[PDB]
Amino acid sequence: TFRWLAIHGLAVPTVFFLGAITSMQFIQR
Amino acid sequence: ALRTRLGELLRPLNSEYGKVAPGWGTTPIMGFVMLLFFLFLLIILQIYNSSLIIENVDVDWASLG
Amino acid sequence: GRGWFDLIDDWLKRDRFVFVGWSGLLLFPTSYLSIGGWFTGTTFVTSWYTHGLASSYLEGCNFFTAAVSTPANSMGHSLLLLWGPEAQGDFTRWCQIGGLWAFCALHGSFALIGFCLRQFEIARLVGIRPYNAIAFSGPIAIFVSVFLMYPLGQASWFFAPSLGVAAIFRFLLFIQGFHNFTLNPFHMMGVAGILGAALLCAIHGATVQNTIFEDGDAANTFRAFTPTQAEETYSMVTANRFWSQIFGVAFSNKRWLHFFMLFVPLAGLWTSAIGIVGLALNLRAYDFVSQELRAAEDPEFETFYTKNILLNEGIRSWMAAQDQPHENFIFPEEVLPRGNAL
Amino acid sequence: RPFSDIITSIRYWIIHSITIPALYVAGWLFVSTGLAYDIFGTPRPNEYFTQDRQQVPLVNDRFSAKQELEDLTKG
Amino acid sequence: ASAWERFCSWITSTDNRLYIGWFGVLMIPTLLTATTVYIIAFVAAPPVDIDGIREPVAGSLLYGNNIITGAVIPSSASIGIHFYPIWEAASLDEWLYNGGPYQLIVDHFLLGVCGWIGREWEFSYRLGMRPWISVAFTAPVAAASAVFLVYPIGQGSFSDGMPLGISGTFNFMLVFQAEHNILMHPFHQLGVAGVFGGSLFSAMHGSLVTSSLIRETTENESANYGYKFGQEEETYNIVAAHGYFGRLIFQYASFNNSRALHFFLGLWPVVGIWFTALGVMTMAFNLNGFNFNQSVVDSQGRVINTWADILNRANLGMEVMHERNAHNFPLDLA
Amino acid sequence: MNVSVAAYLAVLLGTFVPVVFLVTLYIQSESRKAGSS
Amino acid sequence: MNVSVAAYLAVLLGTFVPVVFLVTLYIQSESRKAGSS
Amino acid sequence: METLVYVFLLAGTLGVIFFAVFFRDPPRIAK
Amino acid sequence: METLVYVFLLAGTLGVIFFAVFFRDPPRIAK
Amino acid sequence: PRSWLTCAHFFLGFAFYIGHLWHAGRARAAAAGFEKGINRENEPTLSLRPID
Amino acid sequence: SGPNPNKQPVELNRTSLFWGLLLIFVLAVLFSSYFFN
Amino acid sequence: SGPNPNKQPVELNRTSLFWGLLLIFVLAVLFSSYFFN
Amino acid sequence: RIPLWLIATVGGTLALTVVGIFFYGSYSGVGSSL
Amino acid sequence: MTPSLSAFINSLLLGLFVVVIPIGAALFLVSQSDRVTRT
Amino acid sequence: DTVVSSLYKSLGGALDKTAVYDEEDQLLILSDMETFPETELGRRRVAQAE
Numbered sequence A: 001t002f003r004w005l006a007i008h009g010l011a012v013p014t015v016f017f018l019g020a021i022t023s024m025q026f027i028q029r
Numbered sequence B: 001a002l003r004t005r006l007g008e009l010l011r012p013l014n015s016e017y018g019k020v021a022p023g024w025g026t027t028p029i030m031g032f033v034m035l036l037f038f039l040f041l042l043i044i045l046q047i048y049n050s051s052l053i054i055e056n057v058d059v060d061w062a063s064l065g
Numbered sequence C: 001g002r003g004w005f006d007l008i009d010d011w012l013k014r015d016r017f018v019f020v021g022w023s024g025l026l027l028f029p030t031s032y033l034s035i036g037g038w039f040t041g042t043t044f045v046t047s048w049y050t051h052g053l054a055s056s057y058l059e060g061c062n063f064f065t066a067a068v069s070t071p072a073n074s075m076g077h078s079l080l081l082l083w084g085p086e087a088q089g090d091f092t093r094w095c096q097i098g099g100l101w102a103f104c105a106l107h108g109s110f111a112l113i114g115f116c117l118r119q120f121e122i123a124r125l126v127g128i129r130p131y132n133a134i135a136f137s138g139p140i141a142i143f144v145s146v147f148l149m150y151p152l153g154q155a156s157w158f159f160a161p162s163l164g165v166a167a168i169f170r171f172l173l174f175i176q177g178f179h180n181f182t183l184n185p186f187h188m189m190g191v192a193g194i195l196g197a198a199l200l201c202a203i204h205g206a207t208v209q210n211t212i213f214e215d216g217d218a219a220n221t222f223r224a225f226t227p228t229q230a231e232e233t234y235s236m237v238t239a240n241r242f243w244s245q246i247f248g249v250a251f252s253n254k255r256w257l258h259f260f261m262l263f264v265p266l267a268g269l270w271t272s273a274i275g276i277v278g279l280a281l282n283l284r285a286y287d288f289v290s291q292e293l294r295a296a297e298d299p300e301f302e303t304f305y306t307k308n309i310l311l312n313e314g315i316r317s318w319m320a321a322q323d324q325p326h327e328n329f330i331f332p333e334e335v336l337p338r339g340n341a342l
Numbered sequence D: 001r002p003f004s005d006i007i008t009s010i011r012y013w014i015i016h017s018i019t020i021p022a023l024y025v026a027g028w029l030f031v032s033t034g035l036a037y038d039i040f041g042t043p044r045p046n047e048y049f050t051q052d053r054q055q056v057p058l059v060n061d062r063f064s065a066k067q068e069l070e071d072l073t074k075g
Numbered sequence E: 001a002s003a004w005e006r007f008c009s010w011i012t013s014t015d016n017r018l019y020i021g022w023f024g025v026l027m028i029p030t031l032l033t034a035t036t037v038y039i040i041a042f043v044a045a046p047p048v049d050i051d052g053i054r055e056p057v058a059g060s061l062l063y064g065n066n067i068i069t070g071a072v073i074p075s076s077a078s079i080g081i082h083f084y085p086i087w088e089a090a091s092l093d094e095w096l097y098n099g100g101p102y103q104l105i106v107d108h109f110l111l112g113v114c115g116w117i118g119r120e121w122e123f124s125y126r127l128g129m130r131p132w133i134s135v136a137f138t139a140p141v142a143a144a145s146a147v148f149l150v151y152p153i154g155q156g157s158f159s160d161g162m163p164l165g166i167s168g169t170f171n172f173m174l175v176f177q178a179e180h181n182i183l184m185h186p187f188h189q190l191g192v193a194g195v196f197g198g199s200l201f202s203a204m205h206g207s208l209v210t211s212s213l214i215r216e217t218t219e220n221e222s223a224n225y226g227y228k229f230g231q232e233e234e235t236y237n238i239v240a241a242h243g244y245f246g247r248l249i250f251q252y253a254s255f256n257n258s259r260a261l262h263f264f265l266g267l268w269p270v271v272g273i274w275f276t277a278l279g280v281m282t283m284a285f286n287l288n289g290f291n292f293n294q295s296v297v298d299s300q301g302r303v304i305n306t307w308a309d310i311l312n313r314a315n316l317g318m319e320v321m322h323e324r325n326a327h328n329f330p331l332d333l334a
Numbered sequence F, G: 001m002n003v004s005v006a007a008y009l010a011v012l013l014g015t016f017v018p019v020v021f022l023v024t025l026y027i028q029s030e031s032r033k034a035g036s037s
Numbered sequence H, I: 001m002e003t004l005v006y007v008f009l010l011a012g013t014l015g016v017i018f019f020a021v022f023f024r025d026p027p028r029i030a031k
Numbered sequence J: 001p002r003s004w005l006t007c008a009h010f011f012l013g014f015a016f017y018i019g020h021l022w023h024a025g026r027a028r029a030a031a032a033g034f035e036k037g038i039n040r041e042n043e044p045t046l047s048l049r050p051i052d
Numbered sequence K, L: 001s002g003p004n005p006n007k008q009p010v011e012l013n014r015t016s017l018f019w020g021l022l023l024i025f026v027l028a029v030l031f032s033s034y035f036f037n
Numbered sequence M: 001r002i003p004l005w006l007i008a009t010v011g012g013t014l015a016l017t018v019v020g021i022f023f024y025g026s027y028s029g030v031g032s033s034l
Numbered sequence N: 001m002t003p004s005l006s007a008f009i010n011s012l013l014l015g016l017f018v019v020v021i022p023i024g025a026a027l028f029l030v031s032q033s034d035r036v037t038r039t
Numbered sequence O: 001d002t003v004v005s006s007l008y009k010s011l012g013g014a015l016d017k018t019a020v021y022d023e024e025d026q027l028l029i030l031s032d033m034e035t036f037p038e039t040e041l042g043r044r045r046v047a048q049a050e
């Protein structure tokens, strides 16, 4: 599970933050 | 090569080069004291940093008088 | 292998995709906690309560203007522990006083320590000399001198380099305007090391790629190399002749060449670190006193140095009000140093 | 096993036709809910200034920083 | 068996200590002229009216400068980018008043470095080595042409080229940042990536080659003597360095091929410096770096500052203080 | 120019002492090489 | 007391240059003697 | 007078460069 | 400041005398 | 539009000078027949007399 | 106490001589303008 | 034009070193009081 | 089973789409001067 | 005991029970389970 | 076993007694230089160079 832990510790925050950023593009003041 | 009085006096203090206790020896207590000294250094660092305010410990020039 | 310490050592030093090692117990958490922290601070956390700025993608900033801004100047040099007397365990107030910068910087220092320890560990286990761990000492010196010792010599963490792109550009121009760091001979030695290292990289790459031996019949010559070959893939003699008769001098020894390639950037970084350590205490090579006195007594004596001093005065006066909001600098238009027209 | 050997496997994509978009949308509702502004204290577009607070807010003491932060962020 | 043939053989001779060649025929006189005039003007030259406002600026050692403040001042702004040789001046004194030595040195030096590019190609052809070291040299030359020639052409004055000094170089930097915001311009950022990556890869490559040196030396002897010039065998274990670097980061990142490694070494700084030279060439014609000033406004619409605005404050201070007596109108269009 | 006066000694001797040190280290070494033969 | 300023350079360098010359001539000779053996 | 020192130092650097180019140790292949 | 130079020169002469007395080349009879 | 056109065509002119240098050098090397590398058998430098 | 077995020769080849001379002269050039002030 | 047959070594024994150092230092001592003025 | 060239094509297309959405947000809404 | 001292002691306790002890236990269990062969 | 006995003040170091002499020579630089055989191409190249 160490491979899983490393790759997913990198990935899960990355996709979460990318979704947040793509949403943040539409805040529209 | 040369033998001297002070050399003879101090020879027992330099006669056990390479003598090693077998195994881990005193390493556990070494690590425990390492932990304690780390904690002490952290305490005094946070005291002067004023992240650890101790009563009756005023870290300031004005504490002198 | 039997003992518990031996078992942990055996597992940590296992040959897998990502080498962990004992240093990994210090690198992987802190490094992770650094990088995500940056990605957190540059994405959601603001500088509104510390600098008066927006510094997150949420506030509207882009990759350039987004940063993890330094703490407030009132914080001084506090460690800004989340449990400390400033935030007192409150995550929101901690992020609002810029404690996330302290988080990122203090975890990054230990991440650099862990990575240098990783270099030492892998060099030891593989069984080569530890020259890569000593070359990373240059970057360690840069980080320590610029992000830790400089603010620790100044009033607070506020004057440290805020972790960003536009933030770093502001740090560059601030340091120039207030310290005149281009005139610092140690900065000069550092930029010499950096540009000379880039020069060495470019010349070495071109020379090696252009004195390659013909080890194939393909016009594309990358496939004509084998990793395990015991033959040099390029002519040292031909390169030596080329550079000797073009430039007068040339490397004749590969080992000297590759140590030189190491030494130049590392020496540059350490030299510039000395200069920034000097700048921490305002011990700055700001001025040449002889020219200042001559220009004071001779109003027709002008040099590019004096023009740079005037530019530094302009930077300081026109930047202080918005760059140090905690000082509450109100400079009227009367006192601001200006020129004719613009 | 090698990276390309995993990526072209169908099982990989049966897993990640559902797992990846789930968190990609979780971030969307993280910020669209306004939850980020509350966790991280970031002012919204209508919170940089307020009545008697048409100037920049700044913390001017180390130890009472939380106190003046509430005082400034009473809203 | 003809005099011209013997002359061509001598010029293209691989037996001269320093190769001349046909590009050297143009390089050596031009570079020697530039060196001579630069040395003479740096040690002793009268002050130069750089800004065309009858305010001479001292750049020579004899007129109260040190090595750091000394410079060959750019030409007068009154000249513009008109050709200003010695024979176009009423006297040599007024040739020196308006900074003609800068034009002379810059023209001869640019021609000389072009000749250096060509001469690098030439020797390689005589050697039988592959070309392209010359192509790598172009990146440094391109930057020099961008600062010394293209920026005057775009701005329209040789006063705008970089001074041939150290403090004048800093002055040119600060004015360029004030007027163009070069730091936010992405080509300069690519150049910064180029030089930083060049230093990184130089340190890394040197460290790994020095770290895996094969044992060919005794303990009371420098390790460099383990390599003999012209030897056939490799002086270090590529496998050891490759494996160490693979364990350091991950296996796929490492360059198992040495030729690809050295191509990348030659590529990264050359492309970075090409990009930053091109960036200066484009800001010569006033295509400036990014301007995110007042890009964040609240719901009411008032500006919330960003780091771009705080950088703008420094740029504005430099803008207002540069050339205090030269501008009579609010816009710095020139 | 109101320049310092010990700066002359500083520059000249800080150039001279290392320079003569290097020249001595070179001459010693060469002499030894010649003496070996 | 008011004294010259280049006299410092005169004295110090006129002592230094011959001294390093003598030291170099000695070390070089010794190195050669050691190399012969 | 500092121009004397500056000129002397620059000339010395140029002389070291000259002697390094033209009086180098000649490269030769070992045996 | 000249007292510094005078003292340094006198001390250097005394040091040369010391090294000449105590680190001389030992006289030995040839064979 | 003047800035756009001037900057673009100055960029492309410099880039095509670089392309000229690359292709002219390669043409000369390939015509002479050493665009793939130095022949280990007949290296020209080893036949040349040493300088200095 | 007799001859020391740890005695070793010391060397500085000509390339190193030129490198050292260049370093010292360039450091003098760089720092002279700062020492004079 | 090849090796010169007129090449000869040069020496300065330690007694001569001390004599030269003493001469130079004493000349400096004597003439410093005249150079400073 | 899925050809890796198609996977690379679709993945690069999606990544470029995400970056272009970032670019649009750069020319629209908060963070844009308008 | 001031609030800062209580916070410091609590920080030490949470550092133990959230960082040091979990990582150590995981290392011990994984090293005891996944063992090298022929040591 | 006792408290004081547990620390084994009496037993030298708590775990320390009867120490062995370490054998490895820690101040030892390896000297196994490697010989690379001369190829025929190498002989041809040095012949041309000579």
Ligand code: CLA
Pocket (backbone or CB within 6 Å): B039, C025, C026, C027, C029, C030, C033, C079, C080, C081, C082, C083, C099, C102, C103, C104, C106, C107, C110, N009, N011, N012, N013, N014, N015, N016, N018, N019, N020
């Ligand atoms: C490699 C691991 C590692 C390292 C080296 C660090 C290092 C750091 N962290 Mg931590 N951190 C880690 C993992 C790590 N962290 C992890 C995994 C998390 C996520 C849960 C965090 C979350 C975190 C936060 C949220 C913060 C830090 C902070 C810090 C800094 C302050 C440390 C401190 O004083 O803590 C306290 C001291 C210790 C933890 C050491 C404990 C020593 C022993 C084991 C205690 C023994 C108890 C003793 C017997 C008790 C008796 C009572 C009394 C008499 C002594 C420092 C740079 C602070 C920071 O960066 O502020 C800007 C901060 O706010 N970290």
Ligand code: CLA
Pocket (backbone or CB within 6 Å): C035, C138, C139, C140, C141, C142, C143, C145, C146, C171, C172, C173, C175, C176, C181, C182, C187, C190, C191, C192, C194, C195, C268, C269, C272, C273, C274, C275, C276, E173, E195, E196
């Ligand atoms: C020719 C132009 C030139 C050059 C080459 C340099 C060169 C330098 N300058 Mg600069 N500088 C210049 C012009 C130039 N300057 C001018 C004109 C000014 C005045 C406006 C300045 C003002 C200036 C200042 C104020 C400072 C410098 C500094 C430096 C040094 C930076 C070293 C470095 O690589 O830091 C890069 C940083 C590091 C190597 C630290 C560690 C980096 C770690 C390893 C990064 C790991 C990242 C990790 C993988 C996570 C990534 C996450 C991802 C999402 C991003 C270097 C000597 C600094 C200095 O002197 O420091 C001693 C400094 O503080 N310069």
Ligand code: CLA
Pocket (backbone or CB within 6 Å): C172, C173, C195, E113, E139, E140, E141, E142, E143, E144, E146, E147, E172, E173, E174, E176, E177, E182, E183, E188, E191, E192, E195, E196, E273, E276, E277, E278, E280, H017
């Ligand atoms: C750490 C921070 C940092 C870094 C890394 C850099 C990096 C760089 N900056 Mg700088 N810069 C900084 C901060 C920094 N800058 C700041 C804060 C500012 C704002 C004030 C600027 C403003 C700025 C400007 C305005 C410019 C730069 C430029 C550059 C580049 C200079 C090197 C170059 O192109 O050489 C390439 C090589 C050469 C220029 C040398 C030419 C060599 C010739 C061909 C031969 C010379 C022969 C010689 C005369 C004789 C030989 C003698 C013999 C005896 C050996 C480089 C990318 C310049 C650039 O990009 O130029 C294109 C530029 O114009 N920067």
Ligand SMILES: C=Cc1c(C)c2cc3nc(c4c5[nH]c(cc6nc(cc1[nH]2)C(C)=C6CC)c(C)c5C(=O)[C@@H]4C(=O)OC)[C@@H](CCC(=O)OC/C=C(\C)CCC[C@H](C)CCC[C@H](C)CCCC(C)C)[C@@H]3C
Pocket (backbone or CB within 6 Å): C031, C034, C035, C038, C039, C104, C105, C107, C108, C109, C111, C112, C115, C132, C135, C136, C138, C139, C143, C162, C163, C164, C165, C168, C265, C266, C269, E196, E199, E200, E203, E204, E207, E248, E249
């Ligand atoms: C800005 C320039 C610069 C960067 C970005 C950089 C980055 C890097 N250095 C590395 C290595 C090296 N760099 C070297 C020499 C140099 N490095 C230089 C300059 C740089 N080096 C220079 C000039 C030299 C020449 C001396 C060597 C010799 C090595 C390596 O061996 C090593 C490597 O493996 O390279 C492939 C790599 C691995 C570091 C690591 O794992 O740290 C561990 C720490 C981590 C991951 C946490 C970072 C903590 C930092 C300090 C604070 C937080 C930073 C934020 C997350 C991001 C800030 C963003 C900014 C916009 C502000 C990485 C690519």
Ligand SMILES: CC(C)=CCC/C(C)=C/CC/C(C)=C/CC/C(C)=C/CC/C(C)=C/CC/C(C)=C/CC/C(C)=C/CC/C(C)=C/CC/C(C)=C/CC1=CC(=O)C(C)=C(C)C1=O
Pocket (backbone or CB within 6 Å): C188, C189, C190, C192, C193, C196, C197, C199, C200, C203, C204, C205, C207, C208, C236, C239, C240, C243, C247, C249, C250, C251, C252, C263, C264, C265, C267, C268, C271, E038, E039, E040, E042, E043, E067, E165, E166, H010, K026, K027, K029, K030
């Ligand atoms: C009147 C006058 C004269 C006017 C002058 C006025 C003026 C302004 C003066 C300038 C003053 C000046 C000189 C001051 C400089 C001060 C300064 C900042 C000094 C920095 C010094 C310092 C200690 C810095 C530390 C960093 C440091 C170590 C940098 C060194 C930089 C350096 C020399 C790098 C190498 C550069 C270089 C040209 C390399 C060439 C190598 C080359 C020949 C390749 C050969 C080669 C390559 C191969 O790949 C192969 C395979 C083979 C075979 C081979 O051969």
Ligand SMILES: CCCCCCCCCCCCCCCC(=O)OC[C@H](COP(=O)(O)OC[C@@H](O)CO)OC(=O)CCCCCCCCCCCCCCC
Pocket (backbone or CB within 6 Å): C246, C247, C248, C249, C250, C251, C252, C253, C254, C256, C257, E018, E028, E224, H010, H013, H014, H016, H017, H020, H021, K013, K015, K016, K018, K019, K022
């Ligand atoms: C027709 C035009 C001709 C113009 C030619 C001009 C060439 C200029 C020569 C410079 C070389 C200087 C001596 C370097 C020292 C030297 O003798 O090196 C010689 C050295 C030879 O090394 P080898 O590999 O033989 O050494 C192995 C041994 O060292 C064993 O360890 O080669 C290099 O390292 C040179 C590469 C750096 C070359 C750049 C040197 C720095 C140049 C900066 C000069 C300062 C300018 C300031 C002036 C005020």
Ligand SMILES: CC1=CCCC(C)(C)[C@H]1/C=C/C(C)=C/C=C/C(C)=C/C=C/C=C(C)/C=C/C=C(C)/C=C/C1=C(C)CCCC1(C)C
Pocket (backbone or CB within 6 Å): A009, A010, A013, A014, A017, A018, C032, C033, C034, C035, C036, C037, C039, C040, M015, M016, M018, M019
């Ligand atoms: C912060 C903090 C506070 C207290 C305790 C706690 C442990 C929570 C601690 C630590 C938190 C941590 C470690 C959180 C983790 C967050 C992490 C790892 C966030 C990282 C997110 C990554 C992001 C966006 C990446 C975005 C990448 C982008 C655009 C890339 C751009 C690109 C795209 C999209 C396509 C091709 C071109 C290119 C440039 C490659």
Ligand SMILES: [Cl-]
Pocket (backbone or CB within 6 Å): C341, E326, E327, E328, E329
């Ligand atoms: Cl005007």
Ligand SMILES: [Fe+2]
Pocket (backbone or CB within 6 Å): C208, E209
């Ligand atoms: Fe190499």
